[PDB]
DNA sequence: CAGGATCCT
DNA sequence: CAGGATCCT
């Protein structure tokens, strides 16, 4: 909200800096968050020229760690403060090159990954259309899975691309989703 | 600000004839559709606020009742306001007090009254007991496997006894 | 469309 | 225990 606007390139340099610097405390132990479990989402992934904030999705190996990842987040040698922080969303105000920016951290479990990536990539208008179409065929789609009568629909997929095509829609790269 | 029980009762009495909503038309809220709930109904000597449940004749009016609430002969402001809860800061005498307005549909009335009467500790026990027999109780109804359990009850007393619990007057619930 | 964190009810 | 309003995501 109050955070400064970033250029796409500014955002990419922040993500790159953070890729090696995130960690969390787990019952005392300090566990590094692997760069490969950090997916850049939001307008940055859609490669928009200006961004209101930086959105990172964190992929967590086991459900037991959800309690601990965002609520005990750490960033090596970066000045920041917490706006709000639960298990699924944490909003930080970070200091970067003498400016204050909003950094949004989200968590997905490994089995949720492609649904999460699809959700947090957006844009909002695109997701409303996609979900409404699935709603007319009696499905509910969210960031956790595809559902039918409050029951998980177990799709045999791994990637976002595979998800979208399994949902019965045309795949477009993030940049071309409107 | 904190109220005595009697202060609270005089506020409710004043408001009983003064609530209305728009909606183009201005519709009076009947005193008989206004139930005092919360610690006032439990007759606690001191209260943190005044809680009133408003009973709505039809579901189509939910959109309009609290979101277009009006009070004749009173100065106030809205804190927050949705279809189910509206919180007002009212001027009474020479003081500011919190007034909480809740809505229940007619078919929900006894569930709402039971919920908003409390106290919280009592409701947690009651609901946990029903949870062990696979029911869910809330302010809207009694449910089983995401299906409304159609008890044909009218009053709160009838509800509690139908739920299989001992009826106690609000003052003695704990 | 769908859901999350906060601070309540 | 179970859920609501606000302002986000
Ligand atoms: N389903 C759904 N998802 C949303 C909604 N708002 C945001 N999201 C998801 C998709 C977004 O790409 C992601 C990040 O939200 P942001 O508000 O940061 O928007 P985005 O990053 O797209 O642009 P911006 O930060 O404004 O440059 O969260 C919503 O109303 N519904
Ligand atoms: N199920 C449930 N009901 C609640 C909860 N908190 C409040 N309520 C309901 C029952 C309460 O009697 C009613 C009014 O809440 P209040 O916070 O105003 O407490 P109460 O009025 O009993 O005392 P006070 O207002 O503090 O004098 O709302 C809760 O956590 N769970
Ligand atoms: Mn963003
Ligand atoms: Mn109260």
Numbering used by the authors:
A (entry chain A): -3 to 174
B (entry chain B): 0 to 22, 24 to 174
Paper text:
To provide a molecular basis for designing better drugs targeting polymerases, African swine fever virus DNA Polymerase X (Pol X) was used as a model for the study. As the simplest DNA polymerase identified to date, Pol X belongs to the polymerase X family and is constituted of 174 amino acids. In this chemical reaction, metal-ion A (MeA) is a catalytic ion and decreases the pKa of 3′-OH, facilitating its attack on the α-phosphate of the incoming dNTP, and metal-ion B (MeB) stabilizes the dNTP-DNA-polymerase complex and increases the electrophilicity of the phosphorus center. To clearly understand the phosphodiester-bond-formation mechanism and the metal-ion catalysis of polymerases, we designed modified dNTP substrates with a chiral α-phosphorus center (α-P center) using a single selenium atom, without affecting the overall and local structures, to explore the absolute configuration inversion and probe the mechanisms of the metal ion–oxygen interactions.
